[PDB]
């Protein structure tokens, strides 16, 4: 299987390249090797975009 990630804190994106999200939302990771912003898909909202890796933790 896979490892999902959960938001630890709310985050308001400044660009549509990034996701806005709320604490407790869950993500699948699309790409985590290019830098500390990870391309992710929100299972909670259905959106795909970058998330800051310091705002999430593995479930």
């Amino acid at each position: 299987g896979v490892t999902l990630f959960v938001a630890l804190y709310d985050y308001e994106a400044r660009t549509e390249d990034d996701l806005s999200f709320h604490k407790g939302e869950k993500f699948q990771i699309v790409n985590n090797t290019e830098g500390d912003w990870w391309l992710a898909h929100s299972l909670t909202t259905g959106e795909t975009g970058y998330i800051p890796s310091n705002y999430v933790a593995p479930v």
Partner: peptide, 12 residues
């Protein structure tokens, strides 16, 4: 920088 390599936000 690329989107992936931008500075991270501070913790809230």
């Amino acid at each position: 920088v690329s989107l992936a390599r931008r500075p991270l936000p501070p913790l809230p």
